[PDB]
Amino acid sequence: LVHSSNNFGAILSST
Amino acid sequence: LVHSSNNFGAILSST
Amino acid sequence: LVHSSNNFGAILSST
Amino acid sequence: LVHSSNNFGAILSST
Amino acid sequence: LVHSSNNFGAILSST
Amino acid sequence: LVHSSNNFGAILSST
Amino acid sequence: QRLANFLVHSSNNFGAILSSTNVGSNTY
Amino acid sequence: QRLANFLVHSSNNFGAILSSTNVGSNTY
Amino acid sequence: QRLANFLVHSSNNFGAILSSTNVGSNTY
Amino acid sequence: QRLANFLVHSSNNFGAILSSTNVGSNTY
Amino acid sequence: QRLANFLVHSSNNFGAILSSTNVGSNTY
Amino acid sequence: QRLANFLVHSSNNFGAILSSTNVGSNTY
Amino acid sequence: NFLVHSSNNFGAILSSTNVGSNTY
Amino acid sequence: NFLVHSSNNFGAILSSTNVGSNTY
Amino acid sequence: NFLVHSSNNFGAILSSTNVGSNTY
Amino acid sequence: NFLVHSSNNFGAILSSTNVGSNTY
Amino acid sequence: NFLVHSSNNFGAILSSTNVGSNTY
Amino acid sequence: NFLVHSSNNFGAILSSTNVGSNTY
């Protein structure tokens, strides 16, 4: 589960 | 489950 | 579970 | 579980 | 479990 | 468990 | 969530880019 | 969450970029 | 969370970048 | 959390970068 | 947590960087 | 935690860096 | 095989070159 | 085979070149 | 095989080059 | 095989080069 | 095989080079 | 095999080079 709030940057998730 | 609120950036998810 | 609030930087998560 | 608040830097997590 | 508050630097965690 | 508050430096943790 | 009076400029690139530039080769 | 009067400039790149530049080779 | 009157400039790069620059080779 | 009147300049790089620069080789 | 009137300049690099620079080789 | 009126300049490097510089080889 | 290249310049030359200012 | 190339310039030349300003 | 290259310059030359200012 | 290269300069030359100012 | 290279300079030359100012 | 290289300079030359100022 990935939760993001007010993301102005770059988010990278690898599973 | 991916939840995004107010995303101004770049979000990358790989599963 | 990944939770991010007000992320202005770069977040990288590898599992 | 990864929790980030007000992240202006670069966060790298490898598991 | 990793908790970060007001991170302006670079945080690296390897497990 | 790693807890960081007001981190302006570089923190490296290896386990 | 309340947000107001904010200007956002976002640019995202996911594609390979190849650029070649030549300026010159003039005889005077 | 309340946010106001903020300007954001975000640039993100995930793609390989190759750039070649040549300036010169002029005869005077 | 209350945030106001803040300017943010964020640049993130995850891609390999190759740059070649040549300036010169002029005959006077 | 209350934050105000702050300017942030953040640059993050995770990609290999190769740069070549040549200046010169002029005949006068 | 209360924070105000602060300027932050953060630069982070995690990638290998190779730089080559040549200046000269001019005949006068 | 209360913090105010502070300027922070942080630089962090985790990547190998190779730099080559040549200046000279001019004939006068 | 006789080849001659002659270039003569007597005029002031001003050159300005800008390459860049790209956002990715 | 006789080839002659002659270029003569006596006029002031001003050149401005801009390449870039692209957003991706 | 006779080849002659001659370049003569008598004019003031001003050159400005900028390469960079790219944000990634 | 006779080759001659001659370059003559009599004009003041001003060159400015900037390479960099890139943010990653 | 006869080769001659001649370069003559009589003009003041000013060169400024900047390489760097990159943020990573 | 006869090769001649001649370079003659009579003009004042000023060269400034800066390489660095990079933040990592």
Side-chain angles (χ1 to χ4, degrees), chain P residues 4-16:
Chain P
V4 157
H5 282 75
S6 177
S7 315
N8 296 127
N9 187 31
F10 302 78
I13 295 181
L14 159 48
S15 311
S16 167

Side-chain angles (χ1 to χ4, degrees), chain G residues 13 15-19, chain H residues 13 15-19, chain I residues 15-19, chain M residues 24, chain O residues 24:
Chain G
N13 169 48
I17 301 180
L18 160 48
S19 310
Chain H
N13 169 48
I17 300 180
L18 160 48
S19 311
Chain I
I17 301 180
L18 160 48
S19 311
Chain M
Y24 303 84
Chain O
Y24 303 84

Side-chain angles (χ1 to χ4, degrees), chain N residues 5-20:
Chain N
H5 282 75
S6 176
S7 315
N8 296 127
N9 187 31
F10 302 78
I13 295 181
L14 159 49
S15 311
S16 167
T17 292
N18 289 337
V19 173

Side-chain angles (χ1 to χ4, degrees), chain G residues 8-25:
Chain G
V8 169
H9 203 111
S10 165
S11 305
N12 312 127
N13 169 48
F14 298 77
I17 301 180
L18 160 48
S19 310
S20 177
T21 296
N22 289 284
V23 174
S25 325

Side-chain angles (χ1 to χ4, degrees), chain J residues 12-23:
Chain J
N12 312 127
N13 169 48
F14 298 77
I17 300 180
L18 160 48
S19 310
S20 177
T21 296
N22 289 284
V23 174

Side-chain angles (χ1 to χ4, degrees), chain C residues 2-13:
Chain C
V2 177
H3 193 295
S4 302
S5 178
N6 289 125
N7 163 48
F8 310 92
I11 296 177
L12 171 43
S13 297

Side-chain angles (χ1 to χ4, degrees), chain R residues 3-17:
Chain R
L3 301 173
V4 157
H5 282 75
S6 177
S7 315
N8 296 127
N9 187 31
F10 302 78
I13 295 181
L14 159 48
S15 311
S16 167
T17 292

